[PDB]
Amino acid sequence: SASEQIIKQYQDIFQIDSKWDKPYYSIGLYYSRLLERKGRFEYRAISYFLLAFEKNTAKVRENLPKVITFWLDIAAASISENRKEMLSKATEDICSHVEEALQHPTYIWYFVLTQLLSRLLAQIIMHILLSLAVEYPSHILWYITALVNSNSSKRVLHILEKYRQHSQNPHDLVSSALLTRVCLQDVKSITSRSGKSLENVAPSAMVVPVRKNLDIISPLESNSPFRPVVSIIRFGSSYKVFSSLKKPKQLNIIGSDGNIYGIMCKKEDVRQDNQYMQFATTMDFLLSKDIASRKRSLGINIYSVLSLREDCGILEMVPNVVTLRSILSTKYESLKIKYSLKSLHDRWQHTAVDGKLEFYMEQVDKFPPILYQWFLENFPDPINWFNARNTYARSYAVMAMVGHILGLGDRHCENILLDIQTGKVLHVDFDCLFEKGKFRLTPNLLDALGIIGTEGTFKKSSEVTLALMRKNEVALMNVIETIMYDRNMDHSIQKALKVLRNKIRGIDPQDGLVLSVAGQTETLIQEATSEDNLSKMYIGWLPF
Structure with a gap:
């Protein structure tokens, strides 16, 4: 009921400029929630939130969707053109954008502008769009090459905008010269590296190296000087070796620059980077914030991905890890009795409905759980052994919980991660929602932890996750969900708005x-532990 005297309060004490500086969010922050509860007055939305970030330069989430809130709104107006007025303002409301970039710094885009291309992958509102993008690129010399490592891959192999993206490379040598082209040789070499990945020593067909920038997921750190967005890292030389390209289009390379690193740029879904960036946003969000999160050092782990082709793309890599049937089967196949291979599908194809579904598996259970040994007999003395089991589950639920939070894929073998010498977790691919048939725990896993199964860490850890989850409320709910706006698949779900x-x-x-x-x-x-559902889930998941 203050809806008129809400605003009139704001205007009062703005006399003090920033002062607390908290208000300059709250103007539109509420005014976003104003229309949210349900657009002439919308022209005050971003017009309010612009001056704040200039002053504060904190809380990257406020300007995360403030783009889409701003730019999106403007584009909407244009398209509509009520509509007339909307468009008129959009050419008047968004006028405060570029005019602020002058006043307002050059790094503000890198985190947000990561999704500037990543949303669509247009001409109506794109006018003022890229004028700031590549400009800051020139300004951010360190990241110019990174953005080049990002941008030059699209034009190295998407057509109409590709030329427009090549025109960005055209405007580049115009703007950046107001090196790169030498580094741009990597782009064609990339596609060639993708062509050698498509199709060591002569088959390698790649010399010189001595490139510009690969930082393996530059951080773009904030708060905590701020100039560190690219930090200190760089790279030079590389030699040969091989991927084995173990699946289909994949490519996995060593990197000889400094120490020994391996960056595997593997051809796969281009937008897979979403959760790869998304979870990479919260993992950094969750990490520092409050205490109950920070005291246990949660947040799991992530790694980079970038776009190259409609196939090639990019991915970072995780050293020293083994998974699936190599490790798992090894232990008990020492006793043999291991191999059901494609008999279980067969044998389970021989039953349906409710009849055997808990039973053939409760025979498959007769392969008893050895998993507890794998941590145990691997690295002895407990001070390692102990600290691992902690970091194991402490790093298992904090992520696996986020799985049903987004409802993504059933984890089986190949898609689940466990690092060696220690323990961690990681998660990939795209198995968004649904299922066809019938977070994955089994006979080994649960018991393979401290004889208590799931009590001590699983409970009080997962909860702290679910503490900050609902607490920041729309915060993480605002940004990373653009991933849903990108890919629409398997009919159309706009119900995913509310759920x-x-x-x-x-x-x-x-x-x-x-x-x-x-x-x-x-x-x-x-629920997800179950008894029946867990026993009668798609067999392809090596259930028990």
Whole structure:
């Protein structure tokens, strides 16, 4: 009921300029929530939030969607053109954008502008768009090459904008000269590296090296000087070796620059980087914030990805890791009794409905769990052994929980990660929602932890995750969900709008009420653990 005297308050004490500086968010921050609850007055939305970041330069989430809130709105107006007025303002409201970039610094885009291309992958509103992008590129010399490493891959092999992206390389040598082209040789070499990946010593067909910038996922650190966006890293020389290209289009290379690193740029889905960047945003968000998160050093781990072709793309790499049937089968196949291969699908194809589904598996269970030994007999003395088991589960739920949070893929063998000499976790591919058939725990895993199965760490860890989740509320809900706006698949789900923010507050699964935040683990852990569902899930997942 203050809706008129809401605003009138703001205008009052702005006399003090920043002072607390907190207000300059709250102008539009509320005014975003104003229309959100339900656009002439919308021209004050970004016009408010612009001057704030100039002053504060903190909380990268406020300007994360403030782009889409701003730019999106303007584009909408243009398209519509009520509509007339909208468009008129959009050419008047968004006028405060570039005019601020002069006043307002050059690094503000790198984190946000990562999704500037990554949303669509247009001409109506793109006018003022790239004028800031590549300009800052020139200004950010260190990242110019990184952005070049980012940008030059699209034109190195998407056509109409590709030339427009090549025209960005055209405007570049015009703007950047107001080196790169020498580094641009890597772009054609990239596609050639992708061509050698497509099709060591002569087959390699790549010499010289001595390139510009590969930092293996530059951080772009904030708060905590701020000039460190690219930090100190660089790279030079590389030699041969091989990937084996073990799956289909994949490519995995060593990098000989400094120490020994391996950066595997593997041809796969281009937008796979979303959760690769998304979880990379929260992992850095969760990490520092508050105490209960920070005290246990949560956040799991991530690694870079970039776009090259509609196939080639890019990915970083994780050293010293073994997974799936190599490790797992090894232990008990020492006793043999290992190999069901494609009999289990067969044998389970021989039954359906409710008849055997818990049973052939409870025979497959007769391969007893050895997993606990793998941590144990591997690196002895407990001070390692102990500290690992902690870091194991401490790094298992904090992520696997986020799985049903986004509802993404059933983890099986190949897509699950466990590092050696220590323990961690990582998660990839795109198995968004649904399922066809019938977070994956089994006979070994649960018991393979401290004889208590799931009690000590699983409970109090996963909860701290679910603490900050609902707490920051729309914050992480605002940004990374553009990943949903990118790919629409398997018919169309715009229902994912609401079930999006409701599973944050956890109301939907049992239709009655929000469940106690401790229970929201309980009901969701007691579910996905199950007994019947777990025993009768698609067999292709090596269930027990």
